[PDB]
Design an enzyme around this catalytic site. Sequence first.
Site, mmCIF file in Angstrom:
data_model
loop_
_atom_site.group_PDB
_atom_site.id
_atom_site.type_symbol
_atom_site.label_atom_id
_atom_site.label_comp_id
_atom_site.label_asym_id
_atom_site.label_seq_id
_atom_site.Cartn_x
_atom_site.Cartn_y
_atom_site.Cartn_z
ATOM 1 N N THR B 29 0.838 -1.184 0.000
ATOM 2 C CA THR B 29 0.000 0.000 0.000
ATOM 3 C C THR B 29 0.878 1.241 0.000
ATOM 4 O O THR B 29 1.788 1.363 0.818
ATOM 5 C CB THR B 29 -0.875 0.030 1.249
ATOM 6 O OG1 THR B 29 -0.037 0.081 2.411
ATOM 7 C CG2 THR B 29 -1.738 -1.220 1.317
ATOM 8 N N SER B 30 0.602 2.162 -0.915
ATOM 9 C CA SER B 30 1.364 3.399 -1.010
ATOM 10 C C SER B 30 1.546 4.005 0.388
ATOM 11 O O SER B 30 0.581 4.153 1.138
ATOM 12 C CB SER B 30 0.624 4.374 -1.931
ATOM 13 O OG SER B 30 1.432 5.481 -2.282
ATOM 14 N N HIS B 88 8.649 0.186 3.202
ATOM 15 C CA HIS B 88 8.127 -1.023 3.819
ATOM 16 C C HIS B 88 9.337 -1.877 4.173
ATOM 17 O O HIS B 88 10.444 -1.614 3.703
ATOM 18 C CB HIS B 88 7.236 -1.798 2.844
ATOM 19 C CG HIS B 88 5.822 -1.307 2.787
ATOM 20 N ND1 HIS B 88 5.228 -0.858 1.635
ATOM 21 C CD2 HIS B 88 4.880 -1.195 3.765
ATOM 22 C CE1 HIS B 88 3.986 -0.489 1.886
ATOM 23 N NE2 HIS B 88 3.749 -0.683 3.175
ATOM 24 N N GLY B 89 9.131 -2.907 4.982
ATOM 25 C CA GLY B 89 10.241 -3.760 5.351
ATOM 26 C C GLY B 89 9.879 -4.871 6.310
ATOM 27 O O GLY B 89 8.801 -4.881 6.907
ATOM 28 N N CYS B 130 8.917 -1.556 8.729
ATOM 29 C CA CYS B 130 8.433 -2.590 9.622
ATOM 30 C C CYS B 130 9.531 -3.630 9.810
ATOM 31 O O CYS B 130 10.463 -3.725 9.003
ATOM 32 C CB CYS B 130 7.179 -3.243 9.043
ATOM 33 S SG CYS B 130 5.653 -2.245 9.264
#
Lengths: 4, 141, 92
Positions: B29-30, B88-89, B130
């Site tokens: 998600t953007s 993200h991650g 994350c």
Amino acid sequence: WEHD
Amino acid sequence: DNSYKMDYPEMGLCIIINNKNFHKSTGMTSRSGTDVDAANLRETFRNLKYEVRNKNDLTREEIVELMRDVSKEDHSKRSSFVCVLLSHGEEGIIFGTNGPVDLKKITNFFRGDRCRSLTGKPKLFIIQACRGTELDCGIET
Amino acid sequence: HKIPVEADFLYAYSTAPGYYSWRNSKDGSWFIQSLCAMLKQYADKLEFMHILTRVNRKVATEFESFSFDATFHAKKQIPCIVSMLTKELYFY
């Protein structure tokens, strides 16, 4: 609101 | 001898990799809001006297390439190095717009032996991503 | 007379291992917004580690998630400082  | 030498001609670079849009074949998600963070960082670090270089929406390859090149630069006249990753991650993994990449692979370019110009100089990696899927429900005080 | 090749590294994670990291649509991620604010206020009188401790308290105490989905509602976060440094850091 959102997460990563 | 308790404090790092910060009186070099230049404080150092400040690479900020800002990823907001991801490929549809990844399921991300953007990251709305990361634009504010990127800009907030830029001004904050500019006051700290850093040469801020912003980068947006990078892929696995591009990320690794940017880091490889920055590590091949001459930091001799610089006192430190900061790198901000916004995306993200997962645990030990930063996400590029198209795919994931180990944080280790990135950091390894700046090791004491792969970058002699930064040896003995502080290498800061700020990570906003994350590291899994656990939720902290907290406790009252 | 040599040093470890992993020394002098400092990682400032926004959240603890295995955990999610929260972000606001308009204000920006809790971590970054706290980090910038603490830097703007203490980078002229505090050592970096001490500044990040402030960042930890601000994030842990002043933030709580909000969601229509219970599953992601009322959640907390704690930043994770990982230092392999060997000296103190001052931005001046």
